[PDB]
A paper describes a structure:
We purified the [name] DBD peptide (residues 94 to 293) as a recombinant protein, and incubated it with the reconstituted nucleosome. The resulting [name] DBD-nucleosome complex was prepared by ultracentrifugation with sucrose and paraformaldehyde gradients (GraFix). Density corresponding to the [name] DBD was observed in approximately 70% of particles, but most of the [name] DBD map was not obvious because of the flexibility and/or multiple conformations of the [name] DBD bound to the nucleosomal DNA. We then determined the cryo-EM structure of the [name] DBD-nucleosome complex with particles, in which the [name] DBD density was clearly visible. In the complex, the [name] DBD tetramer was clearly visualized at the periphery of the nucleosome, near the linker DNA with the p53BS DNA. The 20 bp p53BS DNA is composed of a tandem repeat of the palindromic 5’ GGGCA TGCCC 3’ 10-mer, and each [name] DBD protomer specifically recognizes a 5’ GGGCA 3’ sequence. To accomplish the specific DNA binding in the nucleosome, the [name] DBD tetramer peels 15 bp of the nucleosomal DNA from the histone surface at the entry/exit region, and the [name] DBD binds the p53BS DNA site. Consequently, the linker DNA path of the p53BS is bent by about 40 degrees upon [name] binding. In both the [name] FL-nucleosome and [name] DBD-nucleosome structures, the [name] DBD may contact the nucleosomal histone H3 tail near the His39 residue. The nucleosomal linker DNA re-orientation observed in the [name]-bound state could be induced with the [name] DBD lacking the N- and C-terminal regions, indicating that the [name] DBD alone is sufficient for the specific DNA binding in the nucleosome.
Author numbering:
A (entry chain H): 28 to 122
B (entry chain D): 27 to 121
C (entry chain F): 23 to 102
D (entry chain B): 21 to 102
E (entry chain A): 38 to 134
F (entry chain E): 37 to 134
G (entry chain G): 13 to 118
H (entry chain C): 11 to 119
Write the structure that this text describes.
Amino acid sequence: RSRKESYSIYVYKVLKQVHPDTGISSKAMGIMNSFVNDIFERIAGEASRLAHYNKRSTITSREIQTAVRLLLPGELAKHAVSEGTKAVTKYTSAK
Amino acid sequence: KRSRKESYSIYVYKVLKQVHPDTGISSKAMGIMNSFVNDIFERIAGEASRLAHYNKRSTITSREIQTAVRLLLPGELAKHAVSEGTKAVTKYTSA
Amino acid sequence: RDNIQGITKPAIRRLARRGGVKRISGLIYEETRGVLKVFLENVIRDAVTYTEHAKRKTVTAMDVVYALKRQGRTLYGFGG
Amino acid sequence: VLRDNIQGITKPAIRRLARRGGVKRISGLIYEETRGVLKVFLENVIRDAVTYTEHAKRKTVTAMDVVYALKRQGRTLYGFGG
Amino acid sequence: PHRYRPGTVALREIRRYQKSTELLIRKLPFQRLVREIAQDFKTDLRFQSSAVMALQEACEAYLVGLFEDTNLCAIHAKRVTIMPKDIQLARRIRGER
Amino acid sequence: KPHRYRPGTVALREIRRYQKSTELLIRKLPFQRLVREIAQDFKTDLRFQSSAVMALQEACEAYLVGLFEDTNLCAIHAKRVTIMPKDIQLARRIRGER
Amino acid sequence: KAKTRSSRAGLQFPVGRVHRLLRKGNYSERVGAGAPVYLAAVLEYLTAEILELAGNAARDNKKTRIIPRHLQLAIRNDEELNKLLGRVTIAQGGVLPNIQAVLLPK
Amino acid sequence: RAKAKTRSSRAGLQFPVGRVHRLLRKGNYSERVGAGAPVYLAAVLEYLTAEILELAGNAARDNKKTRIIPRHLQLAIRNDEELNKLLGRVTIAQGGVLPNIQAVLLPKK
Amino acid sequence: SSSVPSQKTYQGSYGFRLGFLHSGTAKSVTCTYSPALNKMFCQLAKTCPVQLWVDSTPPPGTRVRAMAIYKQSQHMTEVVRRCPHHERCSDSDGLAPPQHLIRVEGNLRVEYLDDRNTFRHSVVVPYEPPEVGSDCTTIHYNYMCNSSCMGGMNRRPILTIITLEDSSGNLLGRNSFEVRVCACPGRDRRTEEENLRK
Amino acid sequence: SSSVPSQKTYQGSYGFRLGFLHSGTAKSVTCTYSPALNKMFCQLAKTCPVQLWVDSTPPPGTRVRAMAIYKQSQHMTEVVRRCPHHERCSDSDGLAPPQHLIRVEGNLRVEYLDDRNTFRHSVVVPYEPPEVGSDCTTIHYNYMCNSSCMGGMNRRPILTIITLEDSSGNLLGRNSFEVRVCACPGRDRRTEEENLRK
Amino acid sequence: SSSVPSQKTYQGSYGFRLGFLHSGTAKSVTCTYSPALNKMFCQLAKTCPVQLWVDSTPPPGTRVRAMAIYKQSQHMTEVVRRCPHHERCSDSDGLAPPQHLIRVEGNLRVEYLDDRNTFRHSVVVPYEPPEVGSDCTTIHYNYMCNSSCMGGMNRRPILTIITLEDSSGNLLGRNSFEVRVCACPGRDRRTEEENLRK
Amino acid sequence: SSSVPSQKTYQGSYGFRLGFLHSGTAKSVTCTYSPALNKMFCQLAKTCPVQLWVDSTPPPGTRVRAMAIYKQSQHMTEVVRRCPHHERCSDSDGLAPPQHLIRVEGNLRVEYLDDRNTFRHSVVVPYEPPEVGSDCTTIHYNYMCNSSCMGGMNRRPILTIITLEDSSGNLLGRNSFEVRVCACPGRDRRTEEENLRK
DNA sequence: CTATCGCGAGCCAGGCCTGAGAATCCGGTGCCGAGGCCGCTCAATTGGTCGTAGACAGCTCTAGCACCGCTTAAACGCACGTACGCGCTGTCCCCCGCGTTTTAACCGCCAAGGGGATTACTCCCTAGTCTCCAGGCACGTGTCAGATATAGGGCATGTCCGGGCATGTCC
DNA sequence: GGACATGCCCGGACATGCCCTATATCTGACACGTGCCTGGAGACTAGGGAGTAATCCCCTTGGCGGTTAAAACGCGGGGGACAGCGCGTACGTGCGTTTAAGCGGTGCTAGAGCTGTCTACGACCAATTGAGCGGCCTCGGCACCGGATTCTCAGGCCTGGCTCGCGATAG
């Protein structure tokens, strides 16, 4: 009964959203978890450093956005910024 | 009178006078020394923070710092630095 | 524009000499120019990104230092 | 104490590794250099892994120690924990 | 009897092992080597199974990549056979040598 | 007849000269014009600090010198002396920049 | 009744979990409300892109389940993903079936 | 009140224990920091500074110079295997490169 | 065999071509040729006429050689020979060795060769021009196993290679055709021609 | 052969009878027995179980011999043997001579005889009383040519004669059954059973 | 010949009779017997079964002889022999002289006689008693020319005379039947049977 | 034979042609010629007149030779000869060897040749200019087997080649015609002529 | 007259001397940036308090190590042939090196303005705490999918034979 | 001669080969359900960090002029890139042997992991003050310069030695 931390149910929901006919093996699930954790650490670390360099003590969406622009390639950065902005705007309206 | 800007200049000069009493330092070279010290600082502090996080440790101690130094510094350099740090910490604790 | 020609043939020769090469083919110069330009695109991109995040209109030396550091080559002598 | 285990990395294994790397023909002299390179890799990776193990007050090198060592050496490995 | 031309079976083996995913280094000798090197770093170490598999995956990926770069350097010199000097050049240019 | 050195003697002399010193080898102003030109393709009406351009120039020359070192080593590996574009492409490919 | 921020945002990754991981990562003393939403959203997007390509590769291989090999094919075949993961090794991924032209027979 | 004396003096070090401690506290590394961590860190930083400055001074005297310039720092770093390893990915401004000619490039008799 | 005989068509200096009779595809016609397939269908031991056409007459001493090889590339190095049963049965014409697949009938000057280097069997006769009126020379071959004989051709298709040689055995011309030796040539020819549309 | 082995059923003192499995007549059937025809239909080199039944146990040293003869009277004197192809192919189990049609599988004490006087082949094993749980001893035969093999049985039906003999080969009992070795035992069994009504 | 063999039926002490199979009149049946005509119709070189029936078993050493004679009285003194063509063709079974019309197939103990005094050919085998669980002994003859062979039987009908003899050649019994060797036994049998009504 | 005689028509310097009588086609006719087929149909041993026509008279010592060859190319190398039966029968005219197919009747100066090199048979007579008042010289041939004789021509068509040769045997002229030797020339000629329309 | 030996002349190689460029050294002025001193200010120190986290003890139970046995696939040693690395050679082209012309980089000097850093005020945005509840994560039960082998089911292709034609025969 | 007599050929059709596929069964590895509990969501609070506005000044941008060193261009040539060729040897391929890697079962104990407790230790906060930074001044590093001295390396010339050719003498 040792509770752990994984994104398994959320990865499976996204997969079913994009391809509701494909499964995933344990090794593949481990690779997806490693990938997501690695990305997370990279982006959060760059955002943290960005905030420190600019004498900012709060993690806000502008540093996240700039960090995404720095780390992601061209089309990936543009599509990620568009999806993030639409989603944050919809949440802010929804409160 | 501008804002307070911290640097290691006086400490670099004191160490230099300890090791080379009759040697000076140029501004460009002092800037290079400051860049070096700050870079090492960032590397060691970041690795120690990561080490402590990995082990579910909430306190910064001397063991993670020493281990980080051993990871980042080469062999004989690590041994000498570890020896100096231990002697210095035990002498401080005596006070 | 035409400003890529301001990094002249003798300049690429001098940089290559400091790199230790004794002879330089005629086809080397455009290749070097391309490599240099790509490097600049990546560096300046990161620098300007940092500048804009700070709500500034002038790219600073510190912006460049951060760009170089994150590119994987730390530059000493310009602060930080 | 294990002794002369370096001879367990056989010639056909190195040949197979080269095949996966796209190598078509391999000189007989390749093997000692490859063995040396492999050894170097091990001394660095294991040194970091054991350093982490000792800091953690453990006597068993864990998979996370190795993955972290690889990450801090820039050769991040996926599949054994994040 | 029948004999294959030099090069066809090498290419067949390259395709075979690049198509599949099984490990190419033997488990037990790799573990023995790792343990041997470890005695000179810390005594009576114990190693997890997933730890040895991690070292083996990392080692095989590193060697395969190094052999890719070595092959590219050899072909660059209008050669096909890899030489020790090829390995040394690849490692020097990668910046570890 | 006027004096003339055989091919290479003067090459080595400039190698020794420029490896002994540290003063910059690329012209400041043409590089500056290039940097501002390239920059307007990311953001228009951008400004540059003087120390920013000098930092970029120092970085560029260090990068090029290292790349030329590696290119020379690859050329020598191929029992050649004169460097060519395929040498540059091999050096950058093996470094992982391509 | 309790309704989560992910549900209000129409996203799949958990806003609460990303928020807690940011708060406990010793990254900053405060974190804004929008930052974990943005980060979680980027993660969904990247996951969807990788799973899309890996599924495509699986179907090209007449496989219904994605395997590590398909993940390696997806990451290495896509120019921007390979750049993003330029220094990443995927275990059991293998390599791309790439053969240099000069090595082919005449 | 007792006379004020600094931790750096108590430790026999030149780098400021108080400042390094403050930078660790404010560097967003952890909520808590021990008293011995900044002492150890200051000791390692002082040691590395003393060795680099020692080698740079040696190079400066070899060049009959009494003032350390970036060239001497670059020479000192690159002429030491362990410092060169530690600073393998660092470029020194106005440092130049080590004098070195491959044997194949030298003239032949 | 250490080698594989070339099968490349080569009309050469003398404009050497093959011709075949117009036999239809009655179920059991003894020998019938398919232009669509360039394939002869014939019964075991039955007469198979092959016409030799030339634009000009080759010198006296010129010879005509026939050799079979397997058509499928993986079988090409295997020598085509009679099966163990037919090899042993008592059907030699007094001229042909028992293991040779291909015989020539009605020629006293026939020679059978078992090549010491290639191990290939072949049958050779002197080339004879036609009379000034006639336009071609006919040679009559017999195939002494069915394509299906187990331990022999074992259902593998073969090619017959016909070469025109000078008196030293040097190459003057070459042609070839596929062969199926079978019980019902007409049936089998129509089946394979139909399958061309499939 | 100079002689023909008797085929007369003789149960003898020990009440010797044969029995066979109840295999049906389907496709993929490797061995099926027809009570109507007293005929086994089996595939080449497949297991053919034959049960030996006795009313009482024969003495230790008793042997069981199997021999094939042609069923048709005009062929009876011809020794049944493997065809030239199968004789030459490399399928010997290390125990059986290459030319023997009938093998016993799974018995180290098997002997193969080539009778010096009659020229007949036969295969003999020691008789063993039935195993605990069974009222019969099963022997497993393999037939190493199809009935249709050219140069061999050449489509002539054979009988297998199973003899219970003593150490000196004296007769204690005899039984026999017809055999067809073929590619499709179920098909062929049903055909011959249908033809019984014709 | 100086003489003519008697053809008188003589069952003798052992009750010697002939029997024949019930083969029908299919156009080209290999061998068919006509009770109406006491005549066998058979193809050249094909198996012709003749059954020997006896009421009691003749002594060991008893032999069975077959001899052909022309049926028409004016031809009776002419020795029945193979024609010049078949005599010369290469069809001897290794046992029978080339000029003998009648052969026995499948019997190693067959003897062929060319009588020094009568010039008659005959073929003789040892009489073998039927298995005590059987009714008759079958001998298999082959006739090696057609009745129509020019220079041979030349379309003259023959009788086959079967004699049961002791070891020495002493007459134990005699029977006979007419024979037509022809391409279409069934056709020809039906024709001759029809003509009986004409 | 090692060779095949040329059959090319060659009228030569003397304008050598053949002529034949106008016999009709009563089924029983002894010898009838078909202009449509260039084919003689004749009965065995019956007179077959062949006319030799020339534009000018060849020199004294000129001879006329007749030789048969098989018409079908695959049989061309086989020497045409009498069958074993007719070879053995007692029908020689005192002049012709028993194995020669073609005879000349009514000429004491006939010679029969068995060529030592080619193994071909032929019959040759001196050429005689026509009797005064005649336009041609008639030679009378006899054919001594039927085309159907088994072991002989065996139903294979033949050509007769007539050559005019000088005293050394050198060729002066050549003509040929097909021959069928059969029981009913008129019947068979009409049948083959009718089949021309088929 | 031919052959052998000796002497003289020419060519090639090696050594020595001279010239010439590059470096070293000496002085000189001079300049500007590093070192030191002083005012100030704010950031480290000291002293005390309080929450909490990690050091240690102790219990559990997981998995890593060690071993035995069997199998079989991989490694290994060797034979052999041959393709490729490497050395050598020739060719030609294109890069170096130097002289001459041009141009623009740099230094200095000045002007302007704009934006970067600073400070002050405000307000709203997030940590902290509480209360609750639902989602996510161990544990678990069966089920679904894939591969393999057995049943139909097609072709794959030889042999026999009835029909119908070919061809002899004769009162 | 018409009517049969009688053998031969072959298309029809069966005998009986072999692969060809489809369905069913068995084995192996994986989706979803459940319970719970703890981490996430709603609500309220303070407070301080961030947003915004005004200011100032410095430091970035733009322009003029000269001048000189560097860039551009031409051209001769030589040496280096490159193509071709020969060879020999080292490596690819195959085969029989052997060796150890792998797999499956079993043990046990070392040690990872979890929980409980409490005390040492680090956050926090107020007062102090002295260490460290900004500004100003000066002098010495030391380069920057220029010009004479020292000098090593390269090239050219001269001398000596060796080899080849010619002439003379002797046999």
